[PDB]
Paper text:
Here, we present snapshots of this coupled system, named [name] (Group I Fsr), obtained from two marine methanogens. Fsr organizes as a homotetramer, harboring an intertwined six-[4Fe–4S] cluster relay characterized by spectroscopy. The wire, spanning 5.4 nm, electronically connects the flavin to the siroheme center. Despite a structural architecture similar to dissimilatory sulfite reductases, Fsr shows a siroheme coordination and a reaction mechanism identical to assimilatory sulfite reductases.
MtFsr was solved by molecular replacement, using MjFsr as a template. Notably, the asymmetric unit of MtFsr contains four tetramers (including 96 [4Fe–4S] clusters), providing insights on its natural flexibility. Fsr is organized as follows: the N-terminal ferredoxin domain (MtFsr residues 1–57 containing two [4Fe‒4S] clusters) is linked to the F420H2-oxidase domain (MtFsr residues 58–336, harboring the flavin and one [4Fe‒4S] cluster), which is connected to the C-terminal sulfite reductase domain (MtFsr residues 339–484, 546–618) that binds the siroheme‒[4Fe‒4S] and has an inserted ferredoxin domain (MtFsr residues 485–545, containing two [4Fe‒4S] clusters). The extended loop 171–189 in Fsr serves as a platform to specifically bind both ferredoxin domains, and the Glu 180 coordinates the [4Fe‒4S] cluster 3 (monodentate, 2.22 Å). In MtFsr, the axial ligand is a single atomic species at all sites of the asymmetric unit, which is in proximity but not covalently bound to the iron (2.9 Å). The anion HS− was modeled in the electron density based on the pH 5.5 in the crystallization solution. This species could be the result of cocrystallizing Fsr with reduced [name], which might have forced the complete reduction of bound SO32−. In MtFsr, the modeled HS− is bound by Arg 423, Lys 460 and Lys 462, and one water molecule is stabilized by Arg 355. MtFsr did not accept thiosulfate as an electron acceptor, which is in agreement with the findings for MjFsr5. In addition, we have shown that MtFsr reduces selenite (SeO32−) in vitro with a relative activity of 20.7 ± 7.5% compared to SO32−.
Residue numbers in the entry:
A (entry chain D), B (entry chain C): 207 to 412
Write the structure that this text describes.
Amino acid sequence: YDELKETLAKYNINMDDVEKFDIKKGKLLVYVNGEEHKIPLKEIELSAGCKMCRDFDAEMADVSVGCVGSPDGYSTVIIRTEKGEEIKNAIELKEGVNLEAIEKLRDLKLNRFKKEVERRKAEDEKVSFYWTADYGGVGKRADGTYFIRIRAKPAGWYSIDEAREILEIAEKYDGKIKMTNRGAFEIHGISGFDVEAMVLELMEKG
Amino acid sequence: YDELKETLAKYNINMDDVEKFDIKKGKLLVYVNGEEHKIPLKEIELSAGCKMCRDFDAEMADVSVGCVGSPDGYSTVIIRTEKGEEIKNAIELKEGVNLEAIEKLRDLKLNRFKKEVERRKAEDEKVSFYWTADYGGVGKRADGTYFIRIRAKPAGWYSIDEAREILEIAEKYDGKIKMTNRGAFEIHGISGFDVEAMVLELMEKG
Ligand SMILES: Cc1cc2nc3c(=O)[nH]c(=O)nc-3n(C[C@H](O)[C@H](O)[C@H](O)COP(=O)(O)OP(=O)(O)OC[C@H]3O[C@@H](n4cnc5c(N)ncnc54)[C@H](O)[C@@H]3O)c2cc1C
């Protein structure tokens, strides 16, 4: 609040008189005593934790609502659960949302997060690797690194090509091979900084 | 017996009058009428089953006795068990056996066996893979090929290099990878003709 008020003070805008705020096209819009003042987002310092955030569209909500992707005066509605489906009784909904506009904001937020994580890695600052729990098969070892379990293939049969692919990915991330008593490859010693990239690489290979 | 008798008849020897036989340095020695006759073993047909034999020195006996590697009028004595050690009480034994003379015949016999198995392979003749039981970790599959179980390493840890070596040997012999519920690599589909060569290769890699 103090940062936004101080920023408004720079443009000679009294916060106590503002009619409405808005954030559109990467700019903050202020409506006070008549016309709307345009302030670039770059010029306002965001809450620090927002730099560590990955979730643009509230992907876990029953229903998510925003302005991006839909005409002005309308709200974008993303229905995700049967509870969220009840909004169809309350609102006359239309199709035609601009899906690519929403995805662009997903990527910009993720790139902001990647820059902040890289900066913490370079500066020896603390990182909580909270997104490892986004993925199945990830466990935390006693020493603060992670193991990644590749779900056992039926009857423990692996093609030579498949096994070689697993070893190549393990080598790339300095992982160590452990064979479980259910016939799975489990790769140990993965840095929290590498877990997401390695899992996606494994998923890409099937 | 009939083959030896007819062979001797060709050299004008009546087997009934023979005083002693000997096999030394590639020859059949025949002592008859106070004479020594030498017949190259190459001119004599051996019993068919000997071509499929691997064991020159009776390697499973309590004590094995022969003439190779010791001076004329002595017997070579290879003691292998505590039962065999009792011969030390019956015989004043001497050291100095020519071990290479014995090894030379081990390898000649093995090479003869390899030639006959290869001949049978080429002719699609019946081979009994009786020597697969010389090695641990070898099992017979339902379809007449074999699996080779690599004894699980402690806690199922394998170096990337170790796993790659196993896969390379599996590939060479057209083997298929199965991971056991004790953390072992088990290689399936190995021909009886290849089992020994493959096991020795794995043993060579440690
Ligand atoms: C901080 C912030 C950033 C946003 N950024 C974007 C964006 O980048 N892109 C985008 O498309 N939309 C964004 N929105 C959402 C958008 O501004 C609207 O809130 C949304 O479209 C709903 O509009 P509405 O007219 O349907 O809701 P309304 O009927 O106006 O109701 C708004 C609801 O928002 C809730 N609310 C308001 N402020 C907050 C807050 N600080 N914390 C929690 N709840 C709050 C109120 O409780 C209210 O129920 C943002 C909203 C906020 C609060």
